[PDB]
Design a protein around this nucleic acid. Sequence first.
DNA 1: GAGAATCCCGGTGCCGAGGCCGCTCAATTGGTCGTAGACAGCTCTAGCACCGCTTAAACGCACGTACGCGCTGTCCCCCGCGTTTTAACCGCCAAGGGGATTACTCCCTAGTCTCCAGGCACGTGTCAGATATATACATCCTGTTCCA
DNA 2: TGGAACAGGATGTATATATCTGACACGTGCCTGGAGACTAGGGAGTAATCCCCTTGGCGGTTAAAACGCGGGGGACAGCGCGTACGTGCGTTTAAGCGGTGCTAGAGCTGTCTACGACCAATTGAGCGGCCTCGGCACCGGGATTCTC
Lengths: 95, 98, 93, 93, 108, 107, 101, 102, 74, 85, 83, 42
Amino acid sequence: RYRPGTVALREIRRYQKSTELLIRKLPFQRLVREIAQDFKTDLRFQSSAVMALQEASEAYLVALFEDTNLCAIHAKRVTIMPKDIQLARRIRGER
Amino acid sequence: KPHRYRPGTVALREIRRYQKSTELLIRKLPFQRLVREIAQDFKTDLRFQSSAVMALQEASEAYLVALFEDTNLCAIHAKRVTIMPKDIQLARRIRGER
Amino acid sequence: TRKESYAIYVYKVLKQVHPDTGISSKAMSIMNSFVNDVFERIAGEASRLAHYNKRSTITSREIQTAVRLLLPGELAKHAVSEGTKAVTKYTSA
Amino acid sequence: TRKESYAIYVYKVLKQVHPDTGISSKAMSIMNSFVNDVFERIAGEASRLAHYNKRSTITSREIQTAVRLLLPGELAKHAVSEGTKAVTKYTSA
Amino acid sequence: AKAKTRSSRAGLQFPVGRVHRLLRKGNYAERVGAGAPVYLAAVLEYLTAEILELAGNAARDNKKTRIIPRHLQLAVRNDEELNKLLGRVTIAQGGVLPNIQSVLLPCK
Amino acid sequence: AKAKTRSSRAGLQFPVGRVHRLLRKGNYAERVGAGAPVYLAAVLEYLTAEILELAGNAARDNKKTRIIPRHLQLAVRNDEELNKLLGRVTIAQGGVLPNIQSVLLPK
Amino acid sequence: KTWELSLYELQRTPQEAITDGLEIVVSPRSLHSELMCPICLDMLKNTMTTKECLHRFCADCIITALRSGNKECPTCRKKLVSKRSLRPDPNFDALISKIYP
Amino acid sequence: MHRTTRIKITELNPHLMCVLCGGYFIDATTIIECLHSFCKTCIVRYLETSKYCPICDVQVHKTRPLLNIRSDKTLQDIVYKLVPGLFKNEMKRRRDFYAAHP
Amino acid sequence: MQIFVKTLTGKTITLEVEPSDTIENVKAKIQDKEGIPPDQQRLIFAGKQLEDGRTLSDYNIQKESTLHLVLRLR
Amino acid sequence: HRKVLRDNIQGITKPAIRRLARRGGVKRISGLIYEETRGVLKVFLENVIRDAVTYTEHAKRKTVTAMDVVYALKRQGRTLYGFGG
Amino acid sequence: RKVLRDNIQGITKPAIRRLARRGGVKRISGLIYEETRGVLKVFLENVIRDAVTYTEHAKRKTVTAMDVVYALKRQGRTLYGFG
Amino acid sequence: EGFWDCSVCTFRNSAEAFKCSICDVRKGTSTRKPRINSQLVA
DNA sequence: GAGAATCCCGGTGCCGAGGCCGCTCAATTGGTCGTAGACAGCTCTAGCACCGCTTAAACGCACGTACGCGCTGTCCCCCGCGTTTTAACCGCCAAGGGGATTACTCCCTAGTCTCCAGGCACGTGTCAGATATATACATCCTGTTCCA
DNA sequence: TGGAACAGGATGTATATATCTGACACGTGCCTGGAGACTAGGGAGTAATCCCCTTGGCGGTTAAAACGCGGGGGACAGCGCGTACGTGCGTTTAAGCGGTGCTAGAGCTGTCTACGACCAATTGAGCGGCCTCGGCACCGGGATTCTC
Ligand SMILES: [Zn+2]
Ligand SMILES: [Zn+2]
Ligand SMILES: [Zn+2]
Ligand SMILES: [Zn+2]
Ligand SMILES: [Zn+2]
């Protein structure tokens, strides 16, 4: 068996070499519809609109995780923890 | 021995005073000379209104104060009380200026 | 030449709200800049809406939607209420 | 109804640069969006400048100044060079 | 034919006519409606009234009688929605809100 | 007389006439000068050629005779000036640049 | 700064051109290190010169090197941003043209 | 492997001359905005009166044209190796100039 | 007879209290079940802060009453 | 005709969050990162969808379109390419 | 006019300390001064370049507070109080 | 005018007070009442 | 408890905030006319709901280990204070550069008409490329071996 | 006894070929948007003039910057432990695919009508200039508060 870290590095390389989506389409669609229900009842959605929402969400989360990793390395650790996310968002100005 | 304040008390006193105050903290003539020298490269024989350099100074100090707030937050995150160039660089990179 | 500004109207509103309080020149300039900036933001949003919907005219509906897009929460709600009340009063009289 | 796009001209430029290279539909859509964004940015900057200087016309000077304001460094330099060359070629006819 | 201002017609303090002229001359659309200036003036007046009320409270809490940029900054940065609206705006001669991290403060 | 296009007159591949129409109908100013569209079309053509060349280079490098959004993303993000121009822009199906912090590497 | 004319340079007369009917002979190793492209180590072709450090490279060589990574000059480690930092050198192209056809 | 070549010097003299002084390249510096090479003294004397290139008339710099000129050891060695005798003539000139004024 | 005490953290705690009980007993069980020191507690009801020597029947506090708690560090 | 949709954020699974973190270059992940990420994504989606629905309602339509989504994202400073505009 | 060289030394250490104190900083290292000088130089370079571009397009030779305001607004640094 | 009721802690403030005597919360506008998610107990 | 900082109070001055008056130009009122859009009608397409099947992926559990989190010790580098020095600031003067305004005229672009070909919708053949299969190379780890 | 070096098995991965295929690139009809001519009216270029404000210099007066000193507190490194996380396996869940059917609603077309641009006359609202008296900056003196 491999020591911890090798499989993580291989996964990092694999997912940085490819460009496909990483979130399940049907759960994402259900979440989008549930969120949209609070604003107007009985709406309809285009598949392209759902796809664009998914692309934007994944790009935003990837950027946020990059900033979180930078914070975690700055704090002399290799594990990302929620206060890193909080600091990153506070400095970005979203909270 | 004469009166001897422990390190930090004067620091908090200055923090309170300068957070209560609202005046500019940089010297007018040095800032004006720096502005003119920087402006020398783009055009030659330029002239400046006084309000222009006043606005420039206001914007500069506002930007620096915000950057120092972010640097302080980074320093506290790194389990320290002293700010450092690493903190400044991390703050700027997260802000997106580098 | 003349230089138009909002100083008189700002002073009227200030006297309506706080009858016994004055305002300095720097504060009045800040208020004028604030009003101009908000005006520009709302007008730009309304123009973009009208261009998006293939319309040639800007209406109270576009202004209302721009206000909803720009102002947050309770501010947008009360601004919409005041705008609707003013439009109704102007149309009735 | 017909919908206009820059696909034909993008293909012309692509064949001018890389004779044996093709482009996919998603890439063409991305290029079209990029061109639209740049056009909108430059036009907005030129309009703002013309309003600032109390002018009623948008000219090559406004376009050049907007390009200098927007594009960074070498990109702005080469864009200004190409624009001036094209303008002088057009007017020398 | 007595002249009655549109601002008095709609019960507003703001210049409906001037707002209409600025909308017409601003290159926003080919034409503008009739209620758009009234709506925009009402919104501007409401925002101004909110700001002025908060600033006046802040100022006379300090026991002064003149609104100053410090009072304006205090009102804006202390109202949450106003601060969100003006997040990217810098007020001249405003200063900063007093706040010190508790870690820096000594305790028991 | 025979109609000669303004694009051919100025030696450009982009639609000078269409650019002029968009400028006129875009509510940018009351009047639009005659030389304005030529400048803008030339600038757009130059920028397109720059990116298209980089995209083509990446495409043939990967041995892909066809440009894809991955190639466009690589070309844009590998150049500092283009990246600064498109800093707030997201490219669909673009992925990310291969980059890992050295501290994360095995010792 | 660093451009003030020296006591020699401020009044030096031009070196007279040699208009006599004489030929010049060069060995294939006379200009070796002067014409070697630092990347491919071969005779220069389609030469490109950096703006800041004035270092010559093969066009394809420098394009590939910059695409691969390490956006600094391979000779002096000075950073260059993109292709826009280089200019073509038809002077050197013509020179090698007559020197080694 | 190239062979040893013998060529007429009048063929490359026009492409090796200096326009401003009419002499061979001595301390050759190039303008980088258009990559145009001249003698250091020639270009430094010209640059104090004009901000445009003598050849193609492109603006060298907006304020300080001296900021975009670089001395080129490449073309330096190019001339010293291509043309025979300039090195000897030149260093003899420096010695006989410095032989009387120290 | 039960009462409800609301804290600044949005926490509503139910207490079993008698109308004849004095506030000394009230804050006694407050410390007992929450650990809040007596000196840090301030009680607000009917727009007035309760006086130390008064009991509930003076304030006419009835069933299902809600009293607001304010914490000030000493 | 639908009644109510619930626990759809759960559909954002821990393996998916790990995949996103791996693409971001993260080597080691704690335990609360999943909940924090779910909250952040919910907030972002709420804002974008609110803007898009406002655009759609102004257009007097009953179908949310990719153009509306693109316009909302551009208004928020998140310009997106490839879906029109 | 004077070459006017070596002016960014005038932003002095006490001034940087005062700015840090207004920002809420308790302890400062020794290199923060050089870092701050570099950052301020970059910021001023950007703003001055934009303002001078506006002024040159206006065909004037005097930089105005309105030009500075326009440059800051373009950069995203909207400033109130100067018109 | 008359005494105004606090929104946060409901203790009746005098017309001349613009911050609450107990919770020190700034008085809100006649239309918008001040919220609670600003600070904590300590 | 001694000592330095800062709030609380009372005077004083001075300058600018607010009120008042004159003018002029821009918002009102009135009418006409052309077209933007509001409404009704129709079409057809693409969004929603449903089915069954297959297998990819998520879930749950166990185990080992490596990394986060105190804890201690040391030493060196900011902090606070006193003394010297230096140049910022304020008040004053003087000159002329150029920003701001006005008047004339001229030429450049909007608007209209007519003509025609450039580009868009539509249809179709062919090959670039995803996918499948097999293989040798680069990583990785544990168990074994020789030297300290 | 451990610690550095090495060999062999397992696994991911780039490399070499064959499948077939759905999207790319090309050819065609035509119709709508772009080009050629011409007029006219106002935006803008050009020249002249005024005076506002920017630049440059001078002399005191300190307020603030610079330099040196002693020392204590904080940054950094080494250590130990035990807890949370990575890796692997087996089981369960439901997502993705391909197909069917229905119909709500987006999109296009005709009409006709009310609404906004444009032009004239005008008169009152708002801007420019002036003037004065009270609110705030600074002054000094106690009294309270925070540190060591
Ligand atoms: Zn180099
Ligand atoms: Zn080479
Ligand atoms: Zn040249
Ligand atoms: Zn020469
Ligand atoms: Zn309260």
